[PDB]
Amino acid sequence: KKVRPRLIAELARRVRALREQLNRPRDSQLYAVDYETLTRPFSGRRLPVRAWADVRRESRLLQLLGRLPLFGLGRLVTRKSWLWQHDEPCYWRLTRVRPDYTAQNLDHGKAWGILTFKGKTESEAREIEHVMYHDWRLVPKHEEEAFTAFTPAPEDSLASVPYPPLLRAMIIAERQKNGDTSTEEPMLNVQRIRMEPWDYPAKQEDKGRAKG
Amino acid sequence: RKNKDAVRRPQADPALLTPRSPVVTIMGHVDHGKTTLLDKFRKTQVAAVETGGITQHIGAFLVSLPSGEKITFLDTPGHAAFSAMRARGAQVTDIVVLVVAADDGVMKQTVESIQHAKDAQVPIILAVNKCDKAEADPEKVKKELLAYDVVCEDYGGDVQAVPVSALTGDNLMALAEATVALAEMLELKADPNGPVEGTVIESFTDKGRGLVTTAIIQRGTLRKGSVLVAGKCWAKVRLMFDENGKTIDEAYPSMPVGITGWRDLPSAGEEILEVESEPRAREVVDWRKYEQEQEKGQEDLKIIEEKRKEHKEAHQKARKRERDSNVLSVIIKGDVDGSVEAILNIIDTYDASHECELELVHFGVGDVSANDVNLAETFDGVIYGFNVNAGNVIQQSAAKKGVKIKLHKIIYRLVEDLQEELSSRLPAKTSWDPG
Amino acid sequence: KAYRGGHLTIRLALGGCTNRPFYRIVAAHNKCPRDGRFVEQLGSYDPLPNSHGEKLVALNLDRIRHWIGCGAHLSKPMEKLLGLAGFFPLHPMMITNAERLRRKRAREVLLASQK
Amino acid sequence: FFVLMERYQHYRQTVRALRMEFVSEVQRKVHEARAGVLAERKALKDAAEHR
RNA sequence: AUAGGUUUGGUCCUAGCCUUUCUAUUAGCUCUUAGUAAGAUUACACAUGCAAGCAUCCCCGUUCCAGUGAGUUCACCCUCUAAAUCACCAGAUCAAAAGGGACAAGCAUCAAGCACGCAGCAAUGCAGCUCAAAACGCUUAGCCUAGCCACACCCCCACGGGAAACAGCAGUGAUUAACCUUUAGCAAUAAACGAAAGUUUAACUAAGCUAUACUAACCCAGGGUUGGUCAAUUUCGUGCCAGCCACCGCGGUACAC
Numbered sequence A: 001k002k003v004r005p006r007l008i009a010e011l012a013r014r015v016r017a018l019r020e021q022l023n024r025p026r027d028s029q030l031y032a033v034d035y036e037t038l039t040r041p042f043s044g045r046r047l048p049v050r051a052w053a054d055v056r057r058e059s060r061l062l063q064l065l066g067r068l069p070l071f072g073l074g075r076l077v078t079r080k081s082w083l084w085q086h087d088e089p090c091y092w093r094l095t096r097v098r099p100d101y102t103a104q105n106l107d108h109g110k111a112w113g114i115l116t117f118k119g120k121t122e123s124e125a126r127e128i129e130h131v132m133y134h135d136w137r138l139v140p141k142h143e144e145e146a147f148t149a150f151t152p153a154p155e156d157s158l159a160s161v162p163y164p165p166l167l168r169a170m171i172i173a174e175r176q177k178n179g180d181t182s183t184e185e186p187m188l189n190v191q192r193i194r195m196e197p198w199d200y201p202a203k204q205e206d207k208g209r210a211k212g
Numbered sequence B: 001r002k003n004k005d006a007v008r009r010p011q012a013d014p015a016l017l018t019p020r021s022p023v024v025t026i027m028g029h030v031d032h033g034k035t036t037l038l039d040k041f042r043k044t045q046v047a048a049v050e051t052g053g054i055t056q057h058i059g060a061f062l063v064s065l066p067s068g069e070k071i072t073f074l075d076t077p078g079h080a081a082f083s084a085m086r087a088r089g090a091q092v093t094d095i096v097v098l099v100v101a102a103d104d105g106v107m108k109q110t111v112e113s114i115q116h117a118k119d120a121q122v123p124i125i126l127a128v129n130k131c132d133k134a135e136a137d138p139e140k141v142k143k144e145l146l147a148y149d150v151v152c153e154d155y156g157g158d159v160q161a162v163p164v165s166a167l168t169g170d171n172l173m174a175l176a177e178a179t180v181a182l183a184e185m186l187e188l189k190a191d192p193n194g195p196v197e198g199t200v201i202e203s204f205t206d207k208g209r210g211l212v213t214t215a216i217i218q219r220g221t222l223r224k225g226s227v228l229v230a231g232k233c234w235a236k237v238r239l240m241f242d243e244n245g246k247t248i249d250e251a252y253p254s255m256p257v258g259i260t261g262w263r264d265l266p267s268a269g270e271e272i273l274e275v276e277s278e279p280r281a282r283e284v285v286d287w288r289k290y291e292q293e294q295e296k297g298q299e300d301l302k303i304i305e306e307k308r309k310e311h312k313e314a315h316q317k318a319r320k321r322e323r324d325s326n327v328l329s330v331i332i333k334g335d336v337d338g339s340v341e342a343i344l345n346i347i348d349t350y351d352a353s354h355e356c357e358l359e360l361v362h363f364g365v366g367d368v369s370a371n372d373v374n375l376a377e378t379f380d381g382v383i384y385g386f387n388v389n390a391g392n393v394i395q396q397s398a399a400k401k402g403v404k405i406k407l408h409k410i411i412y413r414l415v416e417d418l419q420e421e422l423s424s425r426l427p428a429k430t431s432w433d434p435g
Numbered sequence C: 001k002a003y004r005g006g007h008l009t010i011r012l013a014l015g016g017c018t019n020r021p022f023y024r025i026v027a028a029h030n031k032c033p034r035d036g037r038f039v040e041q042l043g044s045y046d047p048l049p050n051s052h053g054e055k056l057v058a059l060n061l062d063r064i065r066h067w068i069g070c071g072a073h074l075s076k077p078m079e080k081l082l083g084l085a086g087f088f089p090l091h092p093m094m095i096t097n098a099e100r101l102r103r104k105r106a107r108e109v110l111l112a113s114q115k
Numbered sequence D: 001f002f003v004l005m006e007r008y009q010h011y012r013q014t015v016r017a018l019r020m021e022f023v024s025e026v027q028r029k030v031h032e033a034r035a036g037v038l039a040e041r042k043a044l045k046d047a048a049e050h051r
Numbered sequence E: 001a002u003a004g005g006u007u008u009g010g011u012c013c014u015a016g017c018c019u020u021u022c023u024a025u026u027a028g029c030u031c032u033u034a035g036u037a038a039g040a041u042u043a044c045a046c047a048u049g050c051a052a053g054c055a056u057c058c059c060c061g062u063u064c065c066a067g068u069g070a071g072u073u074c075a076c077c078c079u080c081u082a083a084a085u086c087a088c089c090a091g092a093u094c095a096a097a098a099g100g101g102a103c104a105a106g107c108a109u110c111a112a113g114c115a116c117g118c119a120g121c122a123a124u125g126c127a128g129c130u131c132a133a134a135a136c137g138c139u140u141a142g143c144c145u146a147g148c149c150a151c152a153c154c155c156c157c158a159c160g161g162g163a164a165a166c167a168g169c170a171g172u173g174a175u176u177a178a179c180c181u182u183u184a185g186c187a188a189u190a191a192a193c194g195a196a197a198g199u200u201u202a203a204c205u206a207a208g209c210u211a212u213a214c215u216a217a218c219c220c221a222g223g224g225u226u227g228g229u230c231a232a233u234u235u236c237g238u239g240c241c242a243g244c245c246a247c248c249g250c251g252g253u254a255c256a257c
């Protein structure tokens, strides 16, 4: 049991961590793209077929904000995918930008803003996910009020739904065994389970980063 | 024991018969341009890329003529040693192109090739090469061949003589035309269906592909999965490949194909026959091995009866050793069974037994192995490798164990080394000669 | 084995012999082999009909509930089995496969009639 | 595709409700076995008998 | 063990060896069929093909599965508490690192190890700690099998170097007494990914080869033995020769060759 140090292992771990940190790839390198092969040159990996037209047609968030004073801070930005998916207005209210100066045209980086989805805002500003994606569009200063015009529909959300047949039978039998005389139908509550569409932006702050 | 052997199918019916490409074997004397002629026809230059500029392997190539026809050229070694290879080529050939150097005329190996052509009963086309150089006398060549019965057309002889110059590639078009004409006259045909029949042209062990045999199909088509039996060995065809190594789906008659998947390495020239399945193939192989064992047992019974009669005569009347210095023990390792057999024939020609014995401890095909080194150590022998490799580990082990591994790439260089060793063992220069 | 990451999953480990599939419902760490270690066995499933034309399924419902509460995921076949048992709603793919089968049957019925 | 998407949405909502019910049941069972009248009474009874 | 044969001129006792039983590998001779299970001798070297993608780009995965047994008391319990799942949370589940305890065989002709302890905040002080109840050391071995531990070409490690890696599937050279297909499919289960239809998977499923084994069958049966232990030999040939034997033994004109 008398141990024998793994000194080289620990040293190599430390050195690899240092090398990764000091050679950390730039965002402009990671999220670069070739518009002929539709492959990111940094990794050489091809983009999905369903993203080809968007990559060839629409533009990136920072690629747009590069043409706005203070990077359009305070403007409203919307995504082509959102425009095609939801009739209700959806957008980010830009609040901060950290561009990738190493980029030739400052067409990459990070952004923070306040999300409005389906006409519902978000209480606090957070990071923008999918910034590098090629489906971003800018909301002109004019038409902003008309575009963001929206009134909520009646809050359609069922309180409860029937239990699955066997579960309902089991609950009823348990009640009868306990002696409860209640004939009330057992209904599974669904209010607390607030469904949120799959395209709802995710917590970018917890999202990982590429490596090389 | 019932006879479960697999026997070549009886001659196919004329209805089954079908046109097949011809097999032409280029035979001649040393450095008379056989491989150069073959290079010209193939449009590829290999004569320059050779060890000693000598053809030491009976190689098959499926050349396509400009007219679109296909011919299987077997380029055979021209040296005196490879008599077995030349004979096997003559056996498998449909036509024999005898290349004779106009400068040097007929030679011993040229006469040997003519004799093999007669034995195989194959039409002979004379290619008088080196015609460009002075003293080139095709008329003299024909006149001398008259002695060996190769009569040219000019002298009312069926054999067609063609003056060519493989170096300058002149008249080769007419040579190919004559080859096509002779093939047409022979009217070669064979069944392209049913169990396959072929002949092994070469065998070897490849470190990546296993036991690989270069064969020529004679009847029926070969495909992946066919079960082949040849001699005492059998295979389930795993990979068919060409001279270039490109996998080929099918092997039609008169095509040279390298076959992988032999459970054991067959001997050169043996017949390959297709059988129904693996159990049937193993049955055939067991029967053949049993027949060979019975023959050997009869011979051994003769010898043992001699010994036992001697001992009985001795008895009824009454009612390790250190090896001598003059005994060279040799291991032989070859790249192919053909080379191994050639070296073994050279050894068997030995006749200087009195002055120094030449014991053949073991022979095989493949790189010098640890077992070869162990045999050499056990018998204080010498390993001779013909175009095989001696890895670094094997070299270290041989150095430790006192064995001598001598790799070689030319048959006559190896033979010179062998005679050198025999002379060294002698108490002077050896009296045995290879030829 | 110190498994980096992973989570529990209620899945069908396959046993039986060749041509005789049989399943043990196992609450097993997802990364562990299909037939390897498992935290707990929660029942069984015989896919081949018995003499009575039944596909016996045993579900340790109490333990299945316990493991769902503890956070075990559910493999798609197990979700379908529970849906059939009525412990869960019918799987959307169960419903959609039924609809696809109905449409294919209607097409084949039309083809047969047009004869 | 649309019918399937709606089916998945409803199915996952109901499944998550069921999962929450089971999680609550597990929490209740563990808290029960830990500090419920039965367990606490048994512990105090054991202590009294020991004394 | 329900025991049996064998020491001697003979008996008793002690004792070793061997026989009878059951497996597995190899070999010899022999072999018809169907279902199923299992399958390089080797941590030696490898041609070839394939084995990791998914997806509206980011992420996630390729750390899994599968493989081998070279190494080897990192495997089990308790404490503590990382990572991961429970849509965010909750403590719950799972389980690293760390601490405590337990944990293979042989050799003592391996008997001493040589700092292997403690106190103090530190300074520094004490001179101690393990060990014939086996320390220290050498050799051997994967284990305690719903599976677990270790390794991943070698230098324990892997920054670096040696060098160019099948111990993934199929396959091959070498080596050994030891030797399966360079099959098909994602139809099922599992995994990865996706919101999802779905896509990928040499995992796996279904097939291929093999009397290695079990089950079932055929109106086409061999192998071994025949002095005693031990079931069962007629006549010849040989004549202490040829030869046979698990042990006792046979053969100098034979139920033992």
Ligand SMILES: Nc1nc2c(ncn2[C@@H]2O[C@H](COP(=O)(O)OP(=O)(O)OP(=O)(O)O)[C@@H](O)[C@H]2O)c(=O)[nH]1
Residues within 6 Å of the ligand: B028, B029, B030, B031, B032, B033, B034, B035, B036, B037, B047, B053, B054, B055, B056, B076, B077, B078, B079, B129, B130, B131, B132, B133, B164, B165, B166, B167, B168
């Ligand atoms: N003078 C002359 N030399 C030629 C001609 N064709 C070939 N050669 C040369 O003759 C020599 C022998 O040719 P090879 O093909 O190597 O000899 P071979 O006859 O096949 O002999 P093996 O080595 O036994 O196969 C080489 O140097 C050739 O280049 C020709 O037409 N004239």
Ligand SMILES: [Mg+2]
Residues within 6 Å of the ligand: B031, B032, B033, B034, B035, B036, B053, B054, B055
């Ligand atoms: Mg030549």
Ligand SMILES: [Mg+2]
Residues within 6 Å of the ligand: none
């Ligand atoms: Mg056997």
Ligand SMILES: [Mg+2]
Residues within 6 Å of the ligand: none
């Ligand atoms: Mg070991």
Ligand SMILES: [Mg+2]
Residues within 6 Å of the ligand: E109
């Ligand atoms: Mg000693």
Ligand SMILES: [Mg+2]
Residues within 6 Å of the ligand: none
């Ligand atoms: Mg290592």
Ligand SMILES: [Mg+2]
Residues within 6 Å of the ligand: none
């Ligand atoms: Mg290796």
Ligand SMILES: [Mg+2]
Residues within 6 Å of the ligand: E166
């Ligand atoms: Mg393999």
Ligand SMILES: [Mg+2]
Residues within 6 Å of the ligand: none
């Ligand atoms: Mg092999």
Ligand SMILES: [Mg+2]
Residues within 6 Å of the ligand: E178
């Ligand atoms: Mg075996």
Ligand SMILES: [Mg+2]
Residues within 6 Å of the ligand: none
């Ligand atoms: Mg007698």
